[PDB]
């Protein structure tokens, strides 16, 4: 069975998508000026030692100058635990269950708009519009303004290979307005914590949460549909047994990891897998490669939606593991379950092929033209 990567030419430089094993699991990369970690055990070691492998990437900026406080992804212990503890109750299974009906209603509304189409782009119809609502609800952003965020996000991703300033100014005004009558929501918790967090900290957290929760989820949705198109026997079984959807989404994350790598900075000289890293060097931890390591996964080149256990690193591991995982799992499940209900047949179009997000550290669909019948 031809993989999505082979069929569509996904990230030829991500050699693990093509079954090739690294020469060694830790290796220095000249173009990025960074150490790459490709192995599962080595990724676990790096992720589990934040004292040596810092997430505060500003430490690598050259002599000179830088304000990332409030961004949990950039924050090391001891502040990391304190900031995460302040916000973590916004991400629980109880919150997931409270938001699920809203996500289901929005999914059905989005599908009504395309249900009669002969062809449509899954990404524009469903995968891009859906994931803003969760982040907007967490941040108490008015329903009126959520469209702004979809536009700004996709625009900024386009520029990278105006919208960011407008988004940040909205976020600063939103922080200032939320101080007027704070409520028992996440914005209020950020405001009330006690030094205290300033609007700069709150804007950093809000920008982080949009980066973290939007396009990742979009890619998960698109990637999973792409996998169903390439593995149609598995897709038929999913359609007939929707309890397979969660394991399908986990295998999609293992096989096409939306976050292909994260970043660390060494704080000291350190040896990993026989390699001598120096202090003040960048380390890229390639979740996508670790997710193909045959020391951990049997037949890692095969897409198997019933793989279980499936301890993939698509949501990370250790202190920074994805706080949004339960929300993302729900969004993917709701999107896929209703898509399959509304379209008894879906196919890619060899004349309008899928395209992929450009970032070298991502693995995901950016456009997915589909046909709703053959003919």
Interface residue with ligand HEM among 54, 217, 223, 230 (CB under 6 A) is 217
Interface residue with Mg ion among 145, 169, 280, 349 (CB under 5 A) is 280
Residue 59's binding partner, choosing from ligand HEM, Mg ion, none, with beta-carbon cut-off 5 to 8 A by kind? Mg ion
The rounded distance, in Å, linking the Cα atoms of 39 and 16 is 11
The rounded distance, in Å, linking the Cα atoms of 372 and 240 is 18
DSSP notation for 158-190: HH---HHHHHHHHHHHHHHHHTSS--SSHHHHH
Q: How many residues bind ligand HEM (CB under 6 A)?
A: 26
- Of 33-41, 54-62, 141-149, 335-343, the segment contacting Mg ion by CB under 5 A is 54-62
To the question of whether residue 280 is assigned a binding role by annotation, the answer is yes
Is the CB of 38 or the CB of 371 nearer to ligand HEM? 38
Q: What are phi and psi of 369, to 5 degrees?
A: -65, 130
- Restricted to residues 291-330, the positions that interact with ligand HEM (CB under 6 A) are 314-316, 320-324, 327-328
- Of 59-67, 186-194, 239-247, 356-364, the segment contacting Mg ion by CB under 5 A is 59-67
Are 329 and 246 within 8 A, CB to CB?
Answer: yes
The rounded distance, in Å, linking the Cα atoms of 44 and 285 is 9
Chain breaks in the chain (C to N over 2.5 A) after: 65, 161, 194
Strands 282-285, 34-37: parallel, antiparallel or unpaired by DSSP?
A: parallel
Q: HSE, CB side, 13 Å, CA atoms: give it for residue 190.
A: 29
Interface residue with Mg ion among 7, 59, 189, 352 (CB under 5 A) is 59
Interface residue with ligand HEM among 224, 262, 348, 366 (CB under 6 A) is 262
To the question of whether residue 254 is assigned a binding role by annotation, the answer is no
Is the CB of 137 or the CB of 229 nearer to ligand HEM? 137
Interface residue with Mg ion among 10, 110, 215, 265 (CB under 5 A) is 265
Residue whose token pair is 């046909």: 371
Question: Which of 61, 234, 22, 215 has the alpha carbon at shortest distance from 134?
Answer: 215
Residue 216 within binding range of ligand HEM, rule CB under 6 A: yes
Residues near Mg ion (CB under 5 A) are 59, 265, 267, 280
Residues near ligand HEM (CB under 6 A) are 55, 72-73, 84, 91, 134, 209, 212-213, 216-217, 220, 258-259, 262, 287, 314-316, 320-324, 327-328
- Positions at the binding site for Mg(2+): 58, 68, 266, 280
């Amino acid at each position: 069975m031809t993989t999505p990567a082979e069929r569509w030419g996904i990230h030829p430089e991500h050699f693990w998508l093509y079954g090739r094993r690294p020469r060694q699991m830790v290796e220095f990369d000249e173009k990025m000026n960074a150490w790459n970690v490709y192995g599962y055990a080595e990724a676990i070691e790096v992720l589990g030692d934040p004292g040596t492998f810092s997430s505060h990437m500003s430490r690598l900026l050259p002599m000179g100058a830088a304000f990332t406080e409030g961004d949990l992804l950039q924050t090391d212990p001891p502040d990391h635990r304190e900031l995460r503890k302040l916000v973590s109750h916004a991400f629980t299974p109880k919150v997931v269950a409270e938001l699920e009906p809203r996500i289901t209603a929005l999914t059905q509304e989005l599908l009504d708009a395309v249900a009669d189409r002969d062809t449509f782009d899954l990404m524009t119809a469903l995968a891009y519009p859906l994931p803003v609502t969760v982040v907007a609800e967490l941040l108490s952003i008015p329903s009126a303004d959520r469209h702004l965020f979809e536009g700004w996000m996709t625009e900024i991703v386009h520029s990278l290979g105006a919208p960011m300033r407008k988004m940040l100014e909205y976020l600063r005004e939103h922080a200032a307005e939320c101080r007027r009558r704070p409520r028992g929501d996440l914005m209020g918790k950020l405001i009330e914590a006690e030094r205290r967090l300033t609007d700069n900290h709150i804007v950093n957290f809000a920008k982080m949460l949009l980066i973290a929760g939007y396009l990742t989820t979009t890619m998960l949705i698109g990637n999973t549909v792409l996998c169903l198109d390439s593995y149609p026997e598995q897709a038929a079984r999913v359609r007939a047994d929707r309890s397979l959807i969660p394991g399908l989404l986990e295998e999609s994350m293992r096989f096409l990891s939306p976050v292909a790598a994260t970043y660390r900075a060494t704080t000291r000289d350190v040896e990993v897998a026989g390699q001598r890293l120096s202090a003040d060097q960048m380390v890229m931890v390639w979740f996508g490669a670790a997710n193909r390591d045959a020391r951990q996964f049997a037949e890692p080149e095969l897409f198997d939606m019933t793989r279980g256990p499936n301890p993939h690193l698509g949501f990370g591991r250790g202190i920074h593991f994805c706080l949004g995982g339960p929300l993302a799992r729900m969004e993917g499940r709701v999107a896929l379950d209703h898509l399959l209900d509304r379209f008894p047949e879906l196919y890619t179009d060899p004349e309008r092929p899928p395209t992929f997000m450009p970032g070298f550290d991502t693995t995901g669909v950016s456009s997915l033209p589909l046909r709703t019948s053959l003919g």
